[PDB]
Design a protein around this nucleic acid. Structure first.
Ligand SMILES: [Cl-]
Ligand SMILES: [Cl-]
Ligand SMILES: [K+]
Ligand SMILES: [Mg+2]
Ligand SMILES: [Mg+2]
Ligand SMILES: [Mg+2]
Ligand SMILES: [Mg+2]
Ligand SMILES: [Mg+2]
Ligand SMILES: [Mg+2]
Ligand SMILES: [Mg+2]
Ligand SMILES: [Mg+2]
Ligand SMILES: [Mg+2]
Ligand SMILES: [Mg+2]
Ligand code: NA
Ligand code: NA
Ligand code: NA
Ligand code: NA
Ligand code: NA
Ligand code: NA
Ligand code: NA
Ligand code: NA
Ligand code: NA
Ligand code: NA
Ligand code: NA
Ligand code: NA
Lengths: 56, 81, 194, 65, 119, 46
RNA sequence: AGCUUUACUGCAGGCUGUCGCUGAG
RNA sequence: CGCACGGAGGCGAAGAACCACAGAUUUCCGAAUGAGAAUCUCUAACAAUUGCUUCGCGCAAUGAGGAACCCCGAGAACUGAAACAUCUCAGUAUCGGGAGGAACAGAAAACGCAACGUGAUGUCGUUAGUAACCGCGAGUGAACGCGAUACAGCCCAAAC
């Protein structure tokens, strides 16, 4: 079985979904945590300094 | 403060339920229950509501098919508006 | 003449001899079985408390905080590290246990602000410090000419910014002359070299 | 227009509610006639009906009902 | 407990407190560990009372030894608020002293005598 | 799949955004829906 | 770069003495 | 009668549009706080942690956001040394916690042009690539003082 095209067929599971807090389709409905804003994990908003160049 | 009845849902299939089953169809606020839809309809047009079926439309609005008692006449209630 | 307080203080100059000694050998037994933060109605070391700002009044709280002894509880490196940074065992934290206690306490009382703290002994594996906190919203305090200063907005979370007494000392701000080139006015302003 | 602010303030707390429920109806009936695609509309008024209701609710709050 | 080396019979504690109440209305009394302490040090103390339910014990530990090396007699009282009440305070008191008794010198004198014998 | 009521309101909305630029907006602006989406070709969130 | 070892240097970990907790005869 | 110049219609001398200030309204999710949930739902709610306390959530506090700046903690490696380990990159990147309109600092157990002298603290110019560090290699690197900016000095603990 190729890891390529043939393994694409079983992909019918729903994970990331429209997030209730930020509106991004990053809410993992199985994890109940947003990969974008962090809703479900952190009260504060997910944000990192590495999302931009150091001097900016 | 939201209202229960938005407006009459007039369409061919809406007309049939009216001319043939004494039913009026409305576009009601989607937070409204059959019971709330019943009252409102009664107090608004002054009729006796026997049964109310709802449905959440692909238009983001809730459609309610209201059936009036044999004492009231759909065609007539509708004609006045 | 000597004040009553002086005796309490004189007793703690040597917490291992005399009555105080026997007292401790007992109290710790119960402390050990208490939590991380235990509010207490009266300061164990009255002189010290009063000395640091304590007052038998409303809005003035006291709590004993327990913190472990020893170096930093550190995880060994999981990636490339030159021999200098491969350390684990001998590394120690830059915040003394007393400042750690002051923080753990203040977090237990989100509305209060840390006024000061003092040591109350330690056994073989832990150290206890009593922290004096203050309710910045109680009028009994907003009207106290000797404490209403702690109510100002800029005194919010003062412990987490090292504005406490043990905080400033630990930041190496004690000396006003030699040795404080890299410490005053701020560690971070001096490029973290202090 | 047809309903000015003065006229609304002259009304009694019971007359405002009266005018309110009255208006709402002229509105609901207007929407229905539009729901039927009824051309005998007058778009400038279904618009007015909304503002009138707004003005009245606004005065009710002001007047303490 | 740490600063208590002898138990005073309930009855004795009753007489003593009694004597204290009359000491406030006749002669003079000092209310509070600091004020008490100074009497013992200034000598102006005939009989000093120390509560047994004090926590921290630090606050009072010194009274006994101090008193001894000052001849000032001292007695124990179970309840803290009982000594405070006798002394005439709404609040309780860790310790108080009879600064010059009054129409109690007889009894007080005996209490002191009763305690010494009680070792 | 079983859609919830909110999921529906959204799907609903997405469907309406999928209409053309009314004939009159053309004349009114003296002369393109950049958010047109095909069911098959494109892909909605969720 | 991955891997090896009686390559160089270090870091965990294990064993062991000592100090503190820690006291009576 | 928004961008937006159509069609129909409407509003304005009862002074509209438009602008300034103040106010009304302000769905649901959201720190999100009655409980649960991909923005919906189930049967009165400061959830949770605190202070005060009429010990009753009765009165209050915290939470989260913000362009960076600020403070307290955790803390690399590429690289430089023409290899490399101390050193260097660098207390940088990145991470944890938190304040304000600015922060921090601050009225000497100072300085030590050693004096018959200076006089809280930041900061700017200089002192100076000086002193000091360093496989004494490569590199690293102040301060007192001075000229300026701005100026401000006080409160407890205890004795009684
Ligand atoms: Cl704090
Ligand atoms: Cl000088
Ligand atoms: K290196
Ligand atoms: Mg693969
Ligand atoms: Mg159904
Ligand atoms: Mg600064
Ligand atoms: Mg369609
Ligand atoms: Mg290699
Ligand atoms: Mg909830
Ligand atoms: Mg190199
Ligand atoms: Mg070399
Ligand atoms: Mg350096
Ligand atoms: Mg110097
Ligand atoms: Na509709
Ligand atoms: Na706090
Ligand atoms: Na340093
Ligand atoms: Na699709
Ligand atoms: Na390899
Ligand atoms: Na608004
Ligand atoms: Na609150
Ligand atoms: Na309460
Ligand atoms: Na090189
Ligand atoms: Na190399
Ligand atoms: Na070196
Ligand atoms: Na000079």
């Amino acid at each position: 079985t190729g890891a390529g095209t043939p393994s694409q067929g079983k992909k019918n599971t729903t994970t990331h979904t429209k997030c209730r807090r930020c509106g991004e389709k990053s809410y993992h409905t199985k994890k109940k945590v947003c990969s974008s804003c962090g809703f479900g994990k952190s009260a504060k908003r997910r944000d990192y300094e590495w999302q931009s160049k150091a001097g900016e | 403060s939201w209202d229960v009845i938005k407006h009459p849902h007039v369409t061919e299939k809406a007309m049939n339920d009216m001319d043939f089953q004494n039913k009026l169809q409305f576009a009601v606020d989607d937070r409204a229950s059959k019971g709330e839809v019943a009252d409102a309809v009664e107090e608004q047009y002054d009729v006796t509501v026997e049964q109310v079926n709802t449905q959440n439309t692909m238009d983001g609005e809730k459609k309610a098919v209201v059936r009036l008692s044999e004492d009231d006449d759909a065609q007539e209630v509708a004609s006045r508006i | 003449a000597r004040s009553a307080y002086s005796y309490i203080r004189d007793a703690w100059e040597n917490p291992g001899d005399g009555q105080l000694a026997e007292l401790q050998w007992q109290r710790q037994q119960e402390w050990r079985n208490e939590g991380a933060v235990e509010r207490i109605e009266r300061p164990t070391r009255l002189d010290k408390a009063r000395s640091q700002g304590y007052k038998a009044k409303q809005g003035v709280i006291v709590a004993r905080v327990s913190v472990r002894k020893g170096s930093a509880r550190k995880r060994r490196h999981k990636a490339g590290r030159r021999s200098k940074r491969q350390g684990v065992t001998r590394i120690t934290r830059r915040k003394d246990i007393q400042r750690v206690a002051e923080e753990r306490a203040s977090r237990t009382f989100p509305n209060l602000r840390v006024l000061n703290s003092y040591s109350v002994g330690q056994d073989g594996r832990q150290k206890w410090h009593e922290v004096i906190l203050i309710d910045p919203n109680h009028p009994a305090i907003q009207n106290d000419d000797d404490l209403s200063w702690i109510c100002a907005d800029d005194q919010a979370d003062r412990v987490f910014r090292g504005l406490t007494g043990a905080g400033r000392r630990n930041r190496g701000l004690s000396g006003k002359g030699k040795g404080s080139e890299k410490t005053r006015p701020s560690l971070r302003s001096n490029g973290g070299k202090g | 227009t047809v309903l000015h602010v003065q006229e609304i303030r002259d009304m009694t707390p019971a007359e405002r509610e009266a005018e309110l429920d009255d208006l709402k109806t002229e509105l609901l009936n207007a929407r229905a006639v539009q729901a039927a695609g009824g051309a005998p509309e007058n778009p400038g008024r279904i618009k007015e009906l909304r503002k009138a209701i707004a003005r009245i609710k606004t005065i009710q709050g002001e007047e303490g009902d | 407990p740490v600063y208590v080396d002898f138990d005073v019979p309930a009855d004795l504690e009753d007489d003593a407190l009694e004597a204290l109440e009359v000491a406030r209305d006749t002669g003079a009394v000092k209310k509070g560990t600091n004020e008490t302490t100074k009497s013992i040090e200034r000598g102006s103390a005939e009989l000093v009372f120390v509560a047994e339910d004090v926590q921290p014990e630090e606050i009072v530990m010194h009274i006994p030894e101090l008193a001894d090396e000052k001849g000032v007699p001292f007695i124990f009282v179970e309840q803290q608020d009982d000594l405070g009440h006798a002394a005439g305070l709404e609040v309780g008191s860790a310790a108080a002293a009879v600064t010059d008794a009054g129409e109690a010198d007889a009894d007080v004198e005996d209490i002191a005598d009763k305690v010494e014998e009680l070792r | 799949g079983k859609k919830s009521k909110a999921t529906k309101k959204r799907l609903a909305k997405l469907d309406n955004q999928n209409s053309r630029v009314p004939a009159w907006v053309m004349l009114k602006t003296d002369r393109r829906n950049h958010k047109r989406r095909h069911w098959r070709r494109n892909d909605t969130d969720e």
